[PDB]
Amino acid sequence: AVPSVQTFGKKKSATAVAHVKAGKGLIKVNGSPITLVEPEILRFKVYEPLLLVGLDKFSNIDIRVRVTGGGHVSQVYAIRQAIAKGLVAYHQKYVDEQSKNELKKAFTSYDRTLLIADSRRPEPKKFGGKGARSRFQKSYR
Amino acid sequence: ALISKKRKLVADGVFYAELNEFFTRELAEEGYSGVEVRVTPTKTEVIIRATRTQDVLGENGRRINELTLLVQKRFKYAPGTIVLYAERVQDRGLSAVAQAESMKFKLLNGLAIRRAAYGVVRYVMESGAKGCEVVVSGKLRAARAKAMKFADGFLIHSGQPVNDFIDTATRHVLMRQGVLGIKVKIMRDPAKSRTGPKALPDAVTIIEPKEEEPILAPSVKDY
Amino acid sequence: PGVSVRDVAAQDFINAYASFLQRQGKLEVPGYVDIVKTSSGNEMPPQDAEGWFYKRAASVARHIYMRKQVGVGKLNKLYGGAKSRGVRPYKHIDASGSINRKVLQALEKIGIVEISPKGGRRISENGQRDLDRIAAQTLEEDE
Amino acid sequence: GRVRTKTVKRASKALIERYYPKLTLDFQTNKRLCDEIATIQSKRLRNKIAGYTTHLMKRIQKGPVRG
Amino acid sequence: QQQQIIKIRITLTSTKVKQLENVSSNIVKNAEQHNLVKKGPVRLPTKVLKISTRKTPNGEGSKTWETYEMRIHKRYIDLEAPVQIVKRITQITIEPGVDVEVVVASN
RNA sequence: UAAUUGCGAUAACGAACGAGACCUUAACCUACUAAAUAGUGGUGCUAGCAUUUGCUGGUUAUCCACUUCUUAGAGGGACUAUCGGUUUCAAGCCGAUGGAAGUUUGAGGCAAUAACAGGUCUGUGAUGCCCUUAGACGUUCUGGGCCGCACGCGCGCUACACUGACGGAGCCAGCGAGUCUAACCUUGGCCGAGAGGUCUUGGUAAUCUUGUGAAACUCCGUCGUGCUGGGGAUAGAGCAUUGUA
């Protein structure tokens, strides 16, 4: 058997856990599920990628994260990569890898640099100034 | 929820800070070098480092016992916990503070400045460091103000990987004319360091190639 | 036949609880309502002149079941309003304690929340009952 | 910008000048070869030198160079 | 009746970790010597000690600043073993740190 | 080119400091493998949309396993790496790329010789000189002022709703902070619209405060065309806290 696989990272205000243990299809991130979530305000990011793969896609995948995080837009940007991971992993290790790779090559130009390593952060604040790069105004004579 | 540790991890710092400051203040005539302390069960393994250990030892009870009693009463330990004992110095000519106090005495005993000044750096380069310099501020005549200096060998300053093998010794002297300040920063060899990064980042070395082989057909012999 | 795993909605739930508890009149409001300013950091008092107590009751009920524990300090700090503090940068400041104390006492008199270990109080066995049979199915048939 | 200093070119010269006939054009293989051979304390130079070495190897393969 | 169970938490004061690896190797060896079940060490986040100050005796002139930090780490390990082997680290092979601190910690 | 960074005929040759090299932080590995401090599964399962044992409170030696939720304790991180143009065709430089990245991968630290009559005798208990040392410029206790204002000068918050509030929905994630010569964090209960008296894990911090529980932002109704949820300068009463005052 396998106790736990490894994967984790840091969103702009959320973190990730390798708690994707064995399930039977359903997907729920305990804060914005697929079934009973109802935001009906900004669903473009879920209308975009779920076109020609299948709508149910509940076979043997289940994102079951005990902990949680996020802010006001980190959550939408986190469920974005969550559904990306779900779609790719549902076809990688269960449905045929032919289906996975053809679906990926179809969805080539839809991962807006979603495969990069986590290196997107703001900058620290430089001293002697008000903002980050901004500097205080001088006192000429 | 029983939650405090920065109150004591910094006490560990300020402890030997104050101690080595007091030692630099008191142990002048010896030519002091420094300390090193380790924490163990009911015995703080403390060591001082010295070049004239016989003087500070005295007649096995002239100074060490009273130093132990001083450090005892400073904190109210149990007499028997602390254990203050000296230790011989390796590379005696390399202790920057030692050479600084040496030059201090060579100045205060009434000797010409430049003679002993180049003498001590010649001596340490003979001992075999990588390089060293010396600078002295203040005045050396009925004059305004000057800053004499000189060096030999090679010197580097600066970046991150200089701090490991560069030394520092900035000291003062209170003469009849006015306060003067000397500074020395001896740079020791990198190869004989035996601790930490040996080679410089600038440095680089390439091992030698292999051996040569003529044609040598497979086999035609009697066996 | 009961509450699902996570059946939830927002403003419809709030208005439903409000209009449902309006015609009951079993809240037993204290009496000093509609004089307070809701916080020590409000710009002006409420303008409805009749309500908002019910709305805050519905609000706290809209996550007494969503979350395990609860706290009066947490409920105040949730909407510790921003003070228009004169010629000064604004700052958030905690809400009124009396309003939350009294609405919590009224909810306890009704029997929704009960003192319990692991911090203060907790949604009651009446909450278990109503998410089982009565309030779950009532909200199902109402929406 | 993408410009090299003294010591990298010096190391490249002294490296090829005793190991011409090895170190294939692949940059990762050049990396592993220089790691096996030399001991470059500057761990970033250990990877920087490989690019210039393979560049000079491409140059000599195209044709002779000066010096 | 010897060979008991304690699940004792023992403290230690240092900052490096190679001594901890040596101690774990030694206790794993002594536990394998008489088939005793091991226990993993403690693990915690790092830390930083910010002290913002000026770079001048008097505050005239420029407005530079300075900060520096530390990373000292006392540790404590949770070992399941009896007293006769708990007391062996400070005795057998004395080196800087490879010791044992007497303390009760099982409730 | 970031450059005394390199190419180069060269009365130059061979070396040093600076540059650079270097350290810190934002970085992935299905690992060497780690922590009842995040806590994890089959939780044996127990009260919760049923002929959907997975979780909601949790079983404080609940399993074989522990990092899978932080981390480095480490180590490999991944460089002009290919095409075009482009100059003794060598330095070097712009586009196309698959991709951790492609002004130096971003930013910070580290700083050359020679100087300034630059600031600091008010950090010194570091001092050369003179002054004071018994009617004290030494030190200590009571009270004022350093916040005083006819007038100018230099930072910074509020302001001219229409792109401005009230009841609510996100309180979730982020670098900090807290004692055996005892006063720091506040949890739910009570009257409290600024404090106050409770008992709580609290003084060797992923454990408790804060699950690091802010506002910014949007809509259900009420708010309008100004001097109304743009104004709050300047003043008058009252309830209070800290501190000997």
Swiss-Prot record, chain A:
Localization per Swiss-Prot or TrEMBL: Cytoplasm
Keyword terms, alphabetized: Acetylation, Cytoplasm, Isopeptide bond, Phosphoprotein, Ribonucleoprotein, Ribosomal protein, Ubl conjugation
Protease found in the keyword field: no
Gene Ontology, cellular component aspect: 90S preribosome; cytosol; cytosolic small ribosomal subunit
InterPro entries per record: Ribosomal_Su5_D2-typ_SF, Ribosomal_uS9, Ribosomal_uS9_CS, Ribsml_uS5_D2-typ_fold_subgr
Positions bearing Phosphothreonine: T68
Source organism superkingdom: Eukaryota
Phosphoserine carried by residues: S32, S59, S74
Region span, Disordered: 121-141
Position(s), cross-link Glycyl lysine isopeptide (Lys-Gly) (interchain with G-Cter in ubiquitin): K28, K45, K57
Biased composition (Basic residues): 132-141
Molecular functions (GO terms): RNA binding; structural constituent of ribosome
One BP term from GO: translational initiation
Pfam families to which the protein is assigned, alphabetical: Ribosomal_S9
Function summary: Component of the ribosome, a large ribonucleoprotein complex responsible for the synthesis of proteins in the cell. The small ribosomal subunit (SSU) binds messenger RNAs (mRNAs) and translates the encoded message by selecting cognate aminoacyl-transfer RNA (tRNA) molecules. The large subunit (LSU) contains the ribosomal catalytic site termed the peptidyl transferase center (PTC), which catalyzes the formation of peptide bonds, thereby polymerizing the amino acids delivered by tRNAs into a polypeptide chain.
Miscellaneous field: Present with 33800 molecules/cell in log phase SD medium.
Quaternary assembly: Component of the small ribosomal subunit (SSU). Mature yeast ribosomes consist of a small (40S) and a large (60S) subunit. The 40S small subunit contains 1 molecule of ribosomal RNA (18S rRNA) and 33 different proteins (encoded by 57 genes). The large 60S subunit contains 3 rRNA molecules (25S, 5.8S and 5S rRNA) and 46 different proteins (encoded by 81 genes).
NCBIfam families hit by this protein: PRK00474.1
Family: Belongs to the universal ribosomal protein uS9 family.
UniProt name for this protein: Small ribosomal subunit protein uS9A
Organism: Saccharomyces cerevisiae (strain ATCC 204508 / S288c)
Phylogenetic lineage: Eukaryota, Fungi, Dikarya, Ascomycota, Saccharomycotina
Swiss-Prot record, chain C:
Keyword terms: Cytoplasm, Ribonucleoprotein, Ribosomal protein, Ribosome biogenesis
Entry keyword Transcription: no
Location(s) in or outside the cell: Cytoplasm
InterPro entries: Ribosomal_eS19, Ribosomal_eS19_CS, WH-like_DNA-bd_sf, WH_DNA-bd_sf
A molecular-function term among this protein's GO annotations: structural constituent of ribosome
Mutant lacking the gene: phenotype: Disruption of a single RPS19 gene reduces cell growth; a double disruption is lethal. Depletion experiments show the proteins are required for correct maturation of precursor rRNA to generate the 18S small rRNA. A specific site between the 18S and 5.8S precursors (site A2 in ETS1) is not cleaved in disruption mutants. Partially assembled ribosomes are retained in the nucleolus rather than being exported to the cytoplasm. All effects are exacerbated in the double disruption. Increases association of NOC4 with 20S/21S pre-rRNA, decreases association of ENP1, TSR1 and RIO2 with 20S/21S pre-rRNA.
Pfam families on file: Ribosomal_S19e (PF01090)
BP term (GO), one: ribosomal small subunit biogenesis
One cellular component (GO) term of this entry: cytosolic small ribosomal subunit
Family label: Belongs to the eukaryotic ribosomal protein eS19 family.
Function: Component of the ribosome, a large ribonucleoprotein complex responsible for the synthesis of proteins in the cell. The small ribosomal subunit (SSU) binds messenger RNAs (mRNAs) and translates the encoded message by selecting cognate aminoacyl-transfer RNA (tRNA) molecules. The large subunit (LSU) contains the ribosomal catalytic site termed the peptidyl transferase center (PTC), which catalyzes the formation of peptide bonds, thereby polymerizing the amino acids delivered by tRNAs into a polypeptide chain.
Miscellaneous section: Present with 29000 molecules/cell in log phase SD medium.
Name of the protein described by the UniProt record: Small ribosomal subunit protein eS19A
Organism: Saccharomyces cerevisiae (strain ATCC 204508 / S288c)
Gene: RPS19A
From Swiss-Prot, chain D:
Physiological role: Component of the ribosome, a large ribonucleoprotein complex responsible for the synthesis of proteins in the cell. The small ribosomal subunit (SSU) binds messenger RNAs (mRNAs) and translates the encoded message by selecting cognate aminoacyl-transfer RNA (tRNA) molecules. The large subunit (LSU) contains the ribosomal catalytic site termed the peptidyl transferase center (PTC), which catalyzes the formation of peptide bonds, thereby polymerizing the amino acids delivered by tRNAs into a polypeptide chain.
Lineage of origin: Eukaryota, Fungi, Dikarya, Ascomycota, Saccharomycotina
Assembly and binders: Component of the small ribosomal subunit (SSU). Mature yeast ribosomes consist of a small (40S) and a large (60S) subunit. The 40S small subunit contains 1 molecule of ribosomal RNA (18S rRNA) and 33 different proteins (encoded by 57 genes). The large 60S subunit contains 3 rRNA molecules (25S, 5.8S and 5S rRNA) and 46 different proteins (encoded by 81 genes).
Compartments in which it is found: Cytoplasm
Organism: Saccharomyces cerevisiae (strain ATCC 204508 / S288c)
Comment field (misc): Present with 30500 molecules/cell in log phase SD medium.
Domain of life: Eukaryota
Name of protein: Small ribosomal subunit protein eS17B
Similarity comment text for this entry: Belongs to the eukaryotic ribosomal protein eS17 family.
Residues of the full protein shown: 2 to 68 of 136
